Amino acid sequence: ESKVVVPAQGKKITLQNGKLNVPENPIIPYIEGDGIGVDVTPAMLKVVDAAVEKAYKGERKISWMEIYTGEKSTQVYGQDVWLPAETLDLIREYRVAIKGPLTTPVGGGIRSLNVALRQELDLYICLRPVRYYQGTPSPVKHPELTDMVIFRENSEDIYAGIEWKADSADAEKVIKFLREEMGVKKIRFPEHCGIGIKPCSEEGTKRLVRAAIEYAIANDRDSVTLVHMGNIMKFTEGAFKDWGYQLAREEFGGELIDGGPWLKVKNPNTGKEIVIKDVIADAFLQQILLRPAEYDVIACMNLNGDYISDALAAQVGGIGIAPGANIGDECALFEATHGTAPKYAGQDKVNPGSIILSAEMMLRHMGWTEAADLIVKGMEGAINAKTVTYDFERLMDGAKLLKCSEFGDAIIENM
């Protein structure tokens, strides 16, 4: 029997015509998260409640409902229950949810729980905005020049988990087929060879890129850059870029800039000419360091998005405070983007900034922009005040060391 308790006071968010109908008392499912989730989640709940209370003068209030996934799920439902069917059902049913870091066990043949949540709920958009918060200790000279929003495709690519182990009967079978029936000759060593499949479809590419362009329009952003490795992988990465440009032309009236290949899409609200361009992935990893100001909205495939998001987070000193969201047509799951750091679990020491900023994204997604704005304001003030957790403090001089919970309070105090 389920151990999830539906809040007595609270109402389910609904979806109508692609628009969320959020009540003043929405029930929001939340997954504590493994390791440090025990530290960061309480801080997030308190910070969000304060922002909501302050923004709407007590008129609105979230009814938090704990659901399970990960190590805590096994402890609540038993041995092999890492991801309960009800969790997938509840997230879909309640439309909006948030979670702390999750870890996948090894030895049992189970694949990434984070990816499982994304694929099973068809949350095809991994949204990762990366900006700099003044006062944050950064390894680069000008982190303030970084203000990007990453639209990472979440349902395809090698990240889809389609592969076979070297020497397995399946691997031999696939390799045999490829060589004998497909005439593949580029497999350097066919024996003791692992094989993975990388899929990329037109519908997959277009729904991701459509969301990216719509975001640029809605937020009056300057450009959308299709990042890919099409020079090497023409049929997957290359097709992604091709379909991205095609979508811009076919659905957003994209016009040619100069002799190509860049396009300009007129923002139907501001009249701003949004530039649609593309950069080879490896070169892009250099350009984010060398010319960050030239980039804004980024649209890319699963793996590249994972790399780009992490690299960007690192350079702005946001490795531990990078917000993230997994959005689909029916529901959305916001999440802390860092690991579980089990060594510090329960020490009330880690930075709750990531999950808090992800809650900021959640609030904005629900249409509660005032509360979201309050969290952004609190984070900016706390960081600028140099009242921070150990991860920031250790890289700074003249900073006040704060516990995880205390930093949560600092954010509230700066709202």
Ligand X SMILES: O=C(O)CCC(=O)C(=O)O
Q: Each residue of 80-103: b (16+ CB within 10 Å) or e?
A: ebbbbebbbebbeebbbbbbbbbb
CA dihedral 307, 312, 318, 322 (to 10 degrees): -60
The reply to whether omega before 23 is within 30° of 0 (cis) is no
Give Cα separations from 394 to 105, 246, 388, 410 (angstroms).
31, 48, 10, 18
Q: What sign does the dihedral 119-122-124-128 (CA atoms) show? A: negative
**Cα 362 to Cα 287: distance, rounded to the nearest angstrom:** 30
- Position 326 contacts ligand X (CB under 6 A): no
**Cα 383 to Cα 402: distance, rounded to the nearest angstrom:** 11
| Single residue of 229, 247, 327, 375 touching a copy of itself by CB under 8 A | 229
**Cα 398 to Cα 2: distance, rounded to the nearest angstrom:** 50
150 or 383: whose CB is closer to Mn ion?
150
Q: Which stretch binds a copy of itself (CB under 8 A): 40-48, 75-83, 150-158, 212-220?
A: 150-158
Q: Which stretch binds ligand X (CB under 6 A): 67-75, 110-118, 216-224, 256-264?
A: 110-118
> How many CA atoms lie within 13 Å of 383's alpha carbon, on the beta-carbon side?
25
- Position 114 contacts ligand X (CB under 6 A): yes
Q: Which stretch binds ligand X (CB under 6 A): 109-117, 129-137, 183-191, 388-396?
A: 109-117
- Least CB distance to a copy of itself at residue 216 (A): 24
| Single residue of 173, 343, 394, 400 touching a copy of itself by CB under 8 A | 173
The answer to whether 155 is a known ligand-binding residue is no
Which residue matches tokens 């396009």? 263
324 or 352: whose CB is closer to ligand X?
324
- Position 306 contacts ligand X (CB under 6 A): yes
117 or 376: whose CB is closer to a copy of itself?
117
The answer to whether 291 is a known ligand-binding residue is no
Count of CB atoms situated within 10 Å of the CB of 182: 8
The answer to whether 340 is a known ligand-binding residue is yes
- Position 201 contacts a copy of itself (CB under 8 A): yes
27 or 148: whose CB is closer to ligand X?
148
Q: How many residues bind ligand X (CB under 6 A)?
A: 6
The answer to whether 124 is a known ligand-binding residue is no
Q: Residues forming the annotated binding site?
A: 103, 112, 114, 118, 128, 152, 306, 310, 338-344, 351, 390, 394
Instruction: List residues binding ligand X (CB under 6 A).
Output: 104, 112, 114-115, 232, 306
